[model samples]
Target: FPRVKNWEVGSITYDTLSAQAQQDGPCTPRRCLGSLVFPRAPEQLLSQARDFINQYYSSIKRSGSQAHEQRLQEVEAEVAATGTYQLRESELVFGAKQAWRNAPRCVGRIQWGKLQVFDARDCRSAQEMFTYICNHIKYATNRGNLRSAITVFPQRCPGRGDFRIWNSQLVRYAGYRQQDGSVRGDPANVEITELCIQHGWTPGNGRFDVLPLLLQAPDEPPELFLLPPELVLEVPLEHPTLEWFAALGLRWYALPAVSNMLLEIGGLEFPAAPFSGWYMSTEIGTRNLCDPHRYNILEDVAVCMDLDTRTTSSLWKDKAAVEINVAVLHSYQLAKVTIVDHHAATASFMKHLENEQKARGGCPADWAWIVPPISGSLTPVFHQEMVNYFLSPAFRYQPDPW
Candidate 1:
C-alpha cells in the first residue's frame, strides 16, 4: 500500500492555506490530497489502464444489452488495437456517459456518495453557460436585486435561458449564495415541487438535468460549492430500475432541483414549450407523438433559432451521432485502514481529487498528456482538507460505511 505522508499532521484546515488554493470549490478539508503518483513505471500505469478498460468491458459484457455490449467491444477493440493508452476524444465522451449511467449503482456503496463525475457530453457548452450566469449573478449582487438578472436573460438569447433565467432567478430569490456573500439568486428554500407545477419539470422529461445551479468553480477563492438543504432526493433517472419517485412520490422536480443547482451556472434552460409538453398534466395525451405546437414553441424559445429549424430526425442524428470529446480530468483516491496488533482498528480517510491541466491548442485541436505526480508530491494543505470533507457525515458513500 502507498503510505500517507504524515500520520501525526493528519488533517489540514482552510485557515492555513492561501486564498488562491481554496477558492470557491469543494476540497477534502485536508492540506495534502492524494495524487495518481506514478510509483512503479509507465508500463504499470498503462497496464492498469488496460486492465481497467478490460474489466469495464467485461462488466458491460455481462450486464449490458446486446447493442450496448457490441459497442463496448468496439470501443475496447479500438483502444487495444491501437496499442496506445492515451484517451481519445470520442472514447472520452463514450466513457463519460458510460460512467454517468454506471455511477449511481455504487452511489450508496462508494467512498463518497458515488463521487460526482462530470459527463463531458455538454461540459463545454455547460461551462460557457455557467460563466455567463456567474457573471450575471455577480452583476446582480452589485445591483442588489433580481430585476437586472431577469432582464439580462430575454425571452430568447444566443443560448438556452429565458426559462433557465426564470429558474435561476427563482433559485437566487430563494437564496443560493456566492463567495461574495451575496445570496444565490435561486434560493434553496423553494420546494422543487412548486417549481415543477409552474415550469412543468417532470419524468419522461425532454430536458436532461433540469434544476440548474452554478457549479462553484473548483479553484475559485473560498471553495464555494453549494449544497442543497438536508432533504435528500435520489435522482430517479440515475436509478431507472427504481420508481421515478420511490421515496418522495415522483417528485420529478427534484431532478431539476438538484441538477439546476449543480449546473445553474450553465445557461441551459427548459424552453416553455418543451417544459409544458413534458410536464403539463393535460399534455399527457401527446406522449410519444410529435407535438406541432411544441415544435413551434421551441422555435420561439430556442436560444439559437437556427437549431429550431432542424427536424427531429436531424436533431436526433446530430446529437446521437456526434460524440463529445472528454478527458478524465480527475478521480478521487480511496484510503484504507487496518488494525495493528493490540491496538484499536482505527481507520479514517479523506477523498482527494487528482487533476491534469492540459491545453488543446490549434483549430481542430490536438491531444496532450499530463504527467502524474510522484507519490508524496501532493502539498500538505491540499491533502488534509480533502480528508475533512470526505469524513463529514454529510458526504454520502456507497455501503454507508462512512
Candidate 2:
C-alpha cells in the first residue's frame, strides 16, 4: 500500500501504571524498557512527548500546540503537565526523586553483576561460593501438570555453565529437591548459567526455544514467569545505525515493525487468518508490501539497549536509520526520536519499502541482523506475483458472490 502521508507523526499514549494494573497492558514497568525504534524523527519524538504530556497533563500542568503554532508559554504549560518538563522552580517532582534514588542502584547493581566481584571477592571457599550462588539462584514458578513439577530448576544455570553444580547447590540449600535426587523447583527457576544459555542460545539444532523456562516441564509455576527484572546485567548491543538515541540520552528501545505495533498504534484489527490481504490492493504501487499473516505484524519489537559515549557514535542517525529501515520487514514502529544537537524540534521520515530487487524471503545474509522476513519469497512481480505468492490466482477465476 502507498505510504499514508498523514504528515503529523503518529502517537500512542500508554499509561505508565496500566501495565501493572491491567491483566494484559503491554507497558509493564519491566516491559517499559522504552522505545526500541531509536532516534525517531523530530515530529515522531514530539508526538511521543505530546502523548506523555497529555497522559500526565494534570500532574505537570504542561500543554500542547493548541493550533500547531501556539506560543511557547502555552505549549510549555502542556509540557509541564506531562511530568517530564521542568519549569525552573516547578515542584512537581513526580518520580524524579525515586528515579534518582534508583539511579545509583541501577549503576551499582549493573557494575556488581558485570564485574563478577561476587565470584572473586566472595569466593573465599568452594562452600561459600556455592552458597552464594545457591542463594542467588533465580526461582520462578507456573502452573504445571503436577504441583510437584511446577517448581523449575534451570537446566542451564547462569554465571557458570554446569547444571550439576546448579542442581547440587539447589539440592544443598533449597531443600525442595526430592529424595530421588530429582531437584524440585519452580518451572520459572533460573540461574546465571540458564541466563547465559538463554542469551547465547542462538538458533541451532532444534533449540529455537531459548528462554530457560520455556523448556521447563508443563507443570512449572506460572508466577515464575511474571517477568524477569530489567537491567539485570548490561551488555552492549552493536548496530550500524540508530544508536544515537542512546548517545543522545534516550535509553532502552525496541524496533518491532509497523504491523506488529499496529494494534498498539491505531488499534488496528487483527484477524485469526490472513485478513490483512484485503488491505493490499494487489495493484502496482499498492501491494501490502509483505504478507501480514506470515510475519508477526505487531508482536516483534526490537529489544531495547542502553547507550554509553564509547558506543554513542555507533548510533549515528544516517547510518543507523538505514540499517534499521532495511532491518524492518514489511512494517515499522517509529518510536520517539529526539534531536541531540539542540532542543529545537526536528522531523525525519521513515519509509517502509518492499525489497523488489531481491525476492522477499528470509533476510539475506547481508541483512541478517534485520528481523527475519517471510519464510519464502512473496515477491510482487506482476498480478501473478500477487496471486502465486499468496491467494492462488486460480481462485480469482471463480465466481464471486457479488
Candidate 3:
C-alpha cells in the first residue's frame, strides 16, 4: 500500500476510493486553503460608487440631469487624480441611507431613509471629534425620543493614519473583572474598560457606569472625554407586575450609538463614522443581560420568578428570558424612551422589504442577525427567504484601534 494526497479522494494510505470520493473533493480551491477571500480594493469601491450614483439619480428621476452629470464628472476626475474622492452633501446623505438599507444585521431598515447625516469630515483634532460626537449624542438622544443619526469624520488618506473612535458604542457600561472571577458590569466590555484604565481613566465600580469616549486622530494619541450625564438618557429596568424586579437595579442607555464601524463611500473610508438607532428590547434583554458570556442573569431571573431551575426541560430559562424582555419593553415605555419589541420590529422589517422591492427591486438581509434571537420562528422574518449582498455607501465592521 502507498499513501497519496488526492483532491478527489481521501488519503490512499491503506484505503480505497469509494463512490462518494469525487463528491467529497474540495468544494473549492479557496475553501481548501481555509477562507473564501474577497478583495475590497479602491477600484471595486469606485465601481460600487458609480453604480450607487447612477441608482440614486434614477430613483429621483433625475438621471443625466446637469447636477447628476456634474457630480459624476467630479467623482471621476478626483478618483483619476488621487485614487479617492469626496462625497457631496447629497451623496453623503443618500449613501448613509443606502448603508442602512444594505445593513443586513439591522432589523430597523424601515426608517433608513430618515437618518440624519452629520458631516464632520474636516475635524483636525481629537477634541473636535469629541465635540462633534457629543453633539451627535445630544441630537440623537433627543431627551429620550431617540433618533437615528450618523456623524461622518474625515476619510482615510494616503500618508495619514485613519481617525477612529475606540468605543463599541458612544454609551457603554464598564466591565470590571472581580477577584472572584465574575464580571461586575458588562463582561463584553472588559477589554475596552482595561484600555480606558490604561489610558489614565478612573472607572467607577457600578453596574451601570457610563464609559468615556476614546477618540483617536491621525498620528496622535487617543484622547478621553467624559460623557455628559444629561446627554445619555437611561431607563431603569422594572416590571409592571413583578414588584421585586425593581430590586435588580439594572439600567441601559436609551440610544444605541455604535462608534467603531467604517463608512465607505465613493472609494473613501470614513473610519470614525458613528451611527445610532433606538434599542430593540431583545438586544438588552436577551444579549446584554442574559447571554452567558455577558451578564448571565437567566438563573437569577428564573429564581426571582420562582420557576423550576432544576432542569433544562423545565423551560425555566425561556420563561425568565421572556419576562426580562417584557421588563425591558415595559421600562422603556414607562420612561418615555423609544424602543421596539421583536414582534413589532420584525413586522416593520417585512413592510420595509416589500417597500424596497417595489422601490429598489430587492432587499438584502442576513438571516441569522435579522431574526430575533428569542422568538425566531414566531417572527415574520424567520419564514421569509432573504438574500444578503454588499452595496456601496455601506457601514462595515473594522478592527478596534486599540
Highest-lDDT candidate: 3
* Model 3, position 360: C-alpha lDDT score: 61
Q: Estimate each model's TM-score.
A: 0.21, 0.15, 0.88
Q: Report the number of clashing residue pairs per model.
A: 68, 61, 0
Ordered from best to worst TM-score, the candidate numbers read: 3, 1, 2
Q: Write the per-residue lDDT of candidate 3 for residues 277-332, one digit (tens) a residue.
A: 89999999999999999888889999999999998999999999999999999999
> Regarding lDDT, does 1 or 3 come out ahead?
3
User: lDDT rank, highest first?
Assistant: 3, 1, 2
* lDDT scores in order: 0.24, 0.20, 0.82
lDDT of 1 by residue, 283-370 (tens): 1111101133221122322222234345675464232111100000000000111101101101111211211001101011000101
After TM-score superposition, the amount by which residue 286's alpha carbon in candidate 2 deviates from its true location, in angstroms, is 28
Best by TM-score: 3
Candidate 3 global TM-score: 0.88
Say what the RMSD of model 2 is: 25.5
* Predicted candidate 1, C-alpha RMSD: 24.6
* Residue 172's lDDT in candidate 3: 94
| Model 1 TM | 0.21
Query: Candidate 2 residues 98-172, lDDT tens each?
Result: 111112101111111111111112133333433333233221111110001011112111233211122211211
